[model samples]
Target: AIPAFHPGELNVYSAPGDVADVSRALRLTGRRVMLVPTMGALHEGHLALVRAAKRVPGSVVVVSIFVNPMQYPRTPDDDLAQLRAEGVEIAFTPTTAAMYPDGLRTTVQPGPLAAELEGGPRPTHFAGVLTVVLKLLQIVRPDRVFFGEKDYQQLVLIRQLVADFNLDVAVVGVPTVREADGLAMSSRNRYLDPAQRAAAVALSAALTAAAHAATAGAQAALDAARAVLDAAPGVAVDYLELRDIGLGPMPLNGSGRLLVAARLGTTRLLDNIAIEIG
Candidate 1:
């Protein structure tokens, strides 16, 4: 059952604060555990994670609904204002500090892993994600954390962060969830109007095409994917990049990260899919 949520502040979810009490009960009756971190706006993508967490023996899935401010624009603007106006209620609207009282510990910023692809674009996005995730891991201390392959860069960076920090939790990647039309499920999809939403189909379609084109030549697949996005009308591609799984540029036939950014009307959206070179 979904836990009761309160209005205002991180205190809204008693689950985090109730950890001590729950653990005591666990100690009384031993149980295995699992945790799934999310920014809320639960959809099929997130539910897939829930299914994985349940597979763990004696597990509990902690779904974090915080709409991280750190993931939003650094400078407040109409874009962010529009996001806030979305119908979905964001729990950690003010800050993660409101949720995790100790705030989050600062660690060395992710090095090269963060400097390309999503990191080069979003700047501190990964730090905010990693820090909040680390905090959650420490608090919940679950046996494993499940993430979606839809956010490819994030999953890769997070797994590395776990290794570098010696985090005890296991990091698992779930398959990307897709719509009937093949667009990846995302909270941002809520912002698109009917036409823009329909047009957004091209993002995934192109990535799919690029993935199919992946062959002995590395750059060929990368270039093919970007071409599909570039050909789409009025899409306003932000950054169409073809890089290795690690966010580094690579020649043909190497693993590829095909990332696309485009404006669906005034809303900026990003989508990516990984490709295995043959």
Candidate 2:
């Protein structure tokens, strides 16, 4: 038997064991639940996702605030006050032990789909992501989950994971939120010093330039973007390639994305722009 919960109050569960119990109890009342997962450094981008969650009619919004050690270190306190103000009903903040109690002996292998781009540089990246995501889906058992398009590749992989595993959950991808100057909002942007921050605009600018030039050809689009990044004095680009929306090789002519990962001083930034070529 499950106890009663106040719909107006935020229910927080740090222990993984009780999350499913609480979630199942809520479903007894026939309320739809949706989850928005985050690493805890909540920004406007994250807030936008939570707001989107609220718009999903008849669903109680739950946000997961775990900083998966396998993904990154440190979660900032910048967005907590705003999150509370948003009236999110549940928060799942689990510790490393609470999440990986079996000693990491097992993890989700996302296969070749993860072997390129972000996965290529950070080899264990997708494995850790998919494993934790699956655990959360099972734990929360939400009818729907929300993600942002800024981490476009991550969003796609999560969708693929659900399809492959046949999990009864829906993955919703929200558009990327950007700063006033067009830089995609991200937690790491805090690391950028004054000069580096100014130069970071080149990432988005390059993407825009490429998108405009794409009608000529793939090579033309690549060259246009490369010119902008190469001219930016302090920026060191890691990879800036065009690919299909699914990250496959670009089609001869149609739509695709120009993805970029570059370093400005010690801080690395990423951004992508949609391109439609004739």
Candidate 3:
């Protein structure tokens, strides 16, 4: 009766088994569990996942915040505060020690799709993501799992991971949340200086145009994206491509993802959009 907050008082569990036990107990009580695995800098994009889970009826949201061996700009103390603000019920804040009890012997290897686009920068990246993600799934065993589509490739690989492993959970991807100016909200956006940030915003605007440009043809999509970036001050394109739905090299067909990677003041940013040729 004390102004009830939910999944009640923000239970933060650091040990794996305890959280696992609590999740199993909830399932036994017939509550559906929703897991949002995070790297622990709870931005609005991440909060969106929490809110997505919260919207489900009879569902208990479990936001897992283990900065995996794979990555990030960690903000542990503040992240917990943010989760409280979102009313995130269960936080599986396990130590690296707890997460890697056996010290990286067995791991999940992602499919070849992991080796494209974003994979060019770090060949080993998605494997690291999959392995820890596998562990989180194992530990939480939630009825549903959440990921953000800002890293679209990561989301695709995760869908592959779930299907390949035949895991008994539904994988949901939240769309890439953006700023009012249309720049995809990324933690690295925090590192951009004024002029650099201006160039960065153009990257989003560039892709926005490419999305509509595809109504003409794939070539026009590429041209539309380039036209904007080409006019931007101090921007270097790492790559701008229109690939088939699978993100492979294209003389693409009906639909494709138009993507770009640009360098602005030593910070590289990537953006993508789904488009269909008319």
Top candidate when judged by lDDT against the true structure: 2
**Per-residue lDDT for 1-278 in model 3, tens only?**
12222456688888888888888888877889999998877789889889999898888899988777663457888998888888778888989988887788888888898877788888989999999888889988999999887877788788889999999999898988899999998888988998888778888899889888877888888888889998899898887877776666665468777778878877888888887876
Per-candidate TM-scores read 0.78, 0.94, 0.93
Question: Where is model 2 poorest over a 10-residue stretch in terms of lDDT?
Answer: 72-81
Q: Which runs in model 1 stand beyond 4 Å of their true positions? A: 1-17, 20-28, 72-108, 251-254
TM-score, ranked from best to worst: 2, 3, 1
Off by over 4 Å in 2: 72-80
lDDT of 2 by residue, 39-153 (tens): 8878799999999998877778888988787764554344455666898888788898988777787789996868888887898899989998998998889999999988888
Tens digits of per-residue lDDT for model 1, 106-211: 5447767776666666788887787777766776676778899888888988888889889987899998888899888887888888888877888988888878
What is the clash count of model 1?
A: 7
lDDT of each: 0.67, 0.84, 0.84
Say which prediction, candidate 1 or candidate 2, comes out ahead on TM-score. Answer: 2
Candidate with better TM-score, 1 vs 3: 3
What total of clashing residue pairs does each candidate reach? 7, 0, 0
